[PDB]
Amino acid sequence: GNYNYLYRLFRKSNLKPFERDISTEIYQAGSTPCNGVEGFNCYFPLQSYG
Amino acid sequence: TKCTLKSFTVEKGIYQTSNFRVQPTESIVRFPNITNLCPFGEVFNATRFASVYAWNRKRISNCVADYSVLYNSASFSTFKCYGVSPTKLNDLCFTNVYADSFVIRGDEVRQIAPGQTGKIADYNYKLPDDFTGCVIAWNSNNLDSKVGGNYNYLYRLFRKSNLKPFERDISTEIYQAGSTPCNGVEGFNCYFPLQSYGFQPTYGVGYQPYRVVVLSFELLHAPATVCGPKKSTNLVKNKCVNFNFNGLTGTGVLTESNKKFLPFQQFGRDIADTTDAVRDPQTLEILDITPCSFGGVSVITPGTNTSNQVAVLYQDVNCTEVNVFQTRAGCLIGAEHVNNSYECDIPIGAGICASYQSIIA
Amino acid sequence: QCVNLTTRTQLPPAYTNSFTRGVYYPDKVFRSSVLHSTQDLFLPFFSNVTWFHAIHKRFDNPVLPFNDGVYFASTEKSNIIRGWIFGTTLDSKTQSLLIVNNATNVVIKVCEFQFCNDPFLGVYYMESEFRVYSSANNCTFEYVSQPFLNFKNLREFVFKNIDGYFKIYSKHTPINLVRDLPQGFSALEPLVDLPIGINITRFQTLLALHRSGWTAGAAAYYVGYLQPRTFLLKYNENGTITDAVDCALDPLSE
Ligand SMILES: *[C@@H]1O[C@H](CO)[C@@H](O[C@@H]2O[C@H](CO)[C@@H](O)[C@H](O)[C@H]2NC(C)=O)[C@H](O)[C@H]1NC(C)=O
Ligand SMILES: *[C@@H]1O[C@H](CO)[C@@H](O)[C@H](O)[C@H]1NC(C)=O
Ligand SMILES: *[C@@H]1O[C@H](CO)[C@@H](O)[C@H](O)[C@H]1NC(C)=O
Ligand SMILES: *[C@@H]1O[C@H](CO)[C@@H](O)[C@H](O)[C@H]1NC(C)=O
Ligand SMILES: *[C@@H]1O[C@H](CO)[C@@H](O)[C@H](O)[C@H]1NC(C)=O
Ligand SMILES: *[C@@H]1O[C@H](CO)[C@@H](O)[C@H](O)[C@H]1NC(C)=O
Ligand SMILES: *[C@@H]1O[C@H](CO)[C@@H](O)[C@H](O)[C@H]1NC(C)=O
Ligand SMILES: *[C@@H]1O[C@H](CO)[C@@H](O)[C@H](O)[C@H]1NC(C)=O
Numbered sequence: 182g183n184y185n186y187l188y189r190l191f192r193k194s195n196l197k198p199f200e201r202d203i204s205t206e207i208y209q210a211g212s213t214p215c216n217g218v219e220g221f222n223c224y225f226p227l228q229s230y231g
Numbered sequence: 232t233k234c235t236l237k238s239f240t241v242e243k244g245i246y247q248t249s250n251f252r253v254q255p256t257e258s259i260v261r262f263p264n265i266t267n268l269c270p271f272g273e274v275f276n277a278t279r280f281a282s283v284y285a286w287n288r289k290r291i292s293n294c295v296a297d298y299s300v301l302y303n304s305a306s307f308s309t310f311k312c313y314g315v316s317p318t319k320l321n322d323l324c325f326t327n328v329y330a331d332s333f334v335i336r337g338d339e340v341r342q343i344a345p346g347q348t349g350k351i352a353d354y355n356y357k358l359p360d361d362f363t364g365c366v367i368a369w370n371s372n373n374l375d376s377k378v379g380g381n382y383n384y385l386y387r388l389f390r391k392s393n394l395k396p397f398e399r400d401i402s403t404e405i406y407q408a409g410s411t412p413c414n415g416v417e418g419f420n421c422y423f424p425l426q427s428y429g430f431q432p433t434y435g436v437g438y439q440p441y442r443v444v445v446l447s448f449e450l451l452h453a454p455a456t457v458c459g460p461k462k463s464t465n466l467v468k469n470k471c472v473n474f475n476f477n478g479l480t481g482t483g484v485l486t487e488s489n490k491k492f493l494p495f496q497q498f499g500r501d502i503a504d505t506t507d508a509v510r511d512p513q514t515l516e517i518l519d520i521t522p523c524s525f526g527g528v529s530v531i532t533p534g535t536n537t538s539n540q541v542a543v544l545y546q547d548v549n550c551t552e553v554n555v556f557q558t559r560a561g562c563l564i565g566a567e568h569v570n571n572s573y574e575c576d577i578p579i580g581a582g583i584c585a586s587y588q589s590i591i592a
Numbered sequence: 593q594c595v596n597l598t599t600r601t602q603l604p605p606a607y608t609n610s611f612t613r614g615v616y617y618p619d620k621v622f623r624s625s626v627l628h629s630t631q632d633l634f635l636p637f638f639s640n641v642t643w644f645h646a647i648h649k650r651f652d653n654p655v656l657p658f659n660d661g662v663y664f665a666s667t668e669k670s671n672i673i674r675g676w677i678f679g680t681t682l683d684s685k686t687q688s689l690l691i692v693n694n695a696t697n698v699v700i701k702v703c704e705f706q707f708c709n710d711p712f713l714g715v716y717y718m719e720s721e722f723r724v725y726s727s728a729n730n731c732t733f734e735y736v737s738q739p740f741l742n743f744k745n746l747r748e749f750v751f752k753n754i755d756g757y758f759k760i761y762s763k764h765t766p767i768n769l770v771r772d773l774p775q776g777f778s779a780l781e782p783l784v785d786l787p788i789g790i791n792i793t794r795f796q797t798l799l800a801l802h803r804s805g806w807t808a809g810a811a812a813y814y815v816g817y818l819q820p821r822t823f824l825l826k827y828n829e830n831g832t833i834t835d836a837v838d839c840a841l842d843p844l845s846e
Contacts, residue, residue, distance in 0.1 A: 453789035
């Protein structure tokens, strides 16, 4: 498994053309705020291809 | 005016240069009452759930479904969708929903997935490779488990062939582990296919019973009866707003109407097929839609060799909605109205003319 | 339970004139004092509509092709006509639509029914006889609603199957004419749109027997067929359709 290539699974909004997002901030996927901490409906945006 | 005429010198006269717009201030979306809710309370929070070989299928149709309450609930330990998005469930519309409810072991919760191979996937509940919908699962150790062991939840352990997607098998045929003939008589190599779970409160996480509801969506040529909830805002009148009434959108001033609709009629049209009357879906009242006060902005000037003073005419615009004078042509700003009568130099209209002597009208 | 009715008197079906009936509102749009030309499934003016009787011994419950739409006219007293039978093969192989009005409410069901050859209801002189089906296997849609209902009542209905939508338009009219359809104008309001999504090519009226064998109460009904054409509809100040022009009837109305 080559896990060195990653894609942004989660984001709040669609990008502009020629826009790059490298920010490793947590995503809030539910009603509960995450406060930078993983948990219920709190996921890392970058997941690796298997 | 110099920009419009593409010249640095402007001859004496009146020049239509721009178009005054009353900009829309608010957005008013009025959608009717969110009634006839889908019965998710009798599926997720029923009295007794079914086994996985005989999973209960509830048909959700002809109702409006509030997936936001289901998604915002923190009791669910697993909320995984495979064909849709969780945040777009309240926006999309589907023909019908199949809700498959059962109880499994905590280690088999991952086995309800497309492309996943397991005993529950092959023999108890199978999902297709192009599955759409969401799988929801939550722990039920406080309810289903019994200190003497809950043996009521059975599961199929053996079958000759794998399941088709969304296929049930409640048959109790004795499996043939070997090649010996079995006529339904159990032997050394012939066992009953349905075994009972060992749900007890002393087991850890992974052997506790998990209640799973799987929602599958159908998008056939049948009408989309199942839709998400509609969040109607408050109604604002007498202002140029963007109205959205039951899918009919536009921009206008919504005032009270004296037109008495018949109860089956919703919108109103004039001779020229423009929507000038409408019914609010929340409260059954009739509203006139007056178009916002668009007008032409005209610039009245003498020659730039003479002077740089200008006057602005807003055509068909009242002077309270923009040296201010009200004419039948419109509102004239920057010209001093006088009681004397002269010959017409620059025509304004409706008997009004402008001249330079400052600019008088 | 099914019963063959074998005491009928043989008689050919009748035909009569539609006059200016069968008009309905094409849309949900209010229009005031304006003339609107519209292209839709409309009933032709002065057309040949099929006339069926229930008199004593006449009991007219055949199965007719639905075509593109059905205009049902009913010169009704004492509520003999109670509902309709909608489908393609009218057996358990396909899926059929049932519209019934019994003594309490109206029930609309889309299921796999096994229809009898002679389906009816019955009133004993108290309603205590239901013989319209023998089974109901796979239901997809159920809808219980408020009741729609010398000849004293005139009931006009338009049934349409467009894009999986079943439109029922209806109008109640107080008349005092004895035998035929009265001549006049009455635009049919839209009553209910049904999300059925099923194929329908045949229909059958449901009547009610009178028991005191069986006796047929005095009723008469009319079947007309909807054709794609243009009407010029007149909308008054109050917004009701008071007159119409059939653009393909004669050169004057053209
Ligand atoms: C009422 O009459 C109809 C018409 O004959 C009967 O329908 C037939 O019933 C026989 C009975 O075996 C079948 O073999 C035929 O195939 C049926 N014909 C059709 C067109 O379906 C009906 O059975 C009679 N009702 C009762 C209660 O006997
Ligand atoms: C049970 O589940 C239903 C799902 O619709 C929910 O509305 C209800 O509030 C739940 N019961 C409790 C006590 O939370
Ligand atoms: C819909 O909701 C509004 C909310 O104020 C209420 O007044 C009204 O009676 C409800 N029902 C209908 C049929 O409009
Ligand atoms: C209506 O049809 C019948 C037979 O189909 C025919 O005998 C009759 O003349 C027709 N009526 C008119 C007015 O044409
Ligand atoms: C509907 O039924 C008729 C006859 O029952 C058939 O000819 C037609 O093809 C059917 N239409 C569809 C879309 O199945
Ligand atoms: C009318 O039909 C409905 C549904 O079939 C039933 O619930 C009701 O009891 C019926 N009423 C009478 C008087 O038979
Ligand atoms: C329809 O009913 C028959 C018997 O009642 C049954 O075998 C069949 O599976 C049913 N089909 C559906 C789609 O419900
Ligand atoms: C329209 O309604 C008014 C009642 O407001 C009535 O007086 C008038 O006669 C009606 N006109 C028509 C043509 O129906």
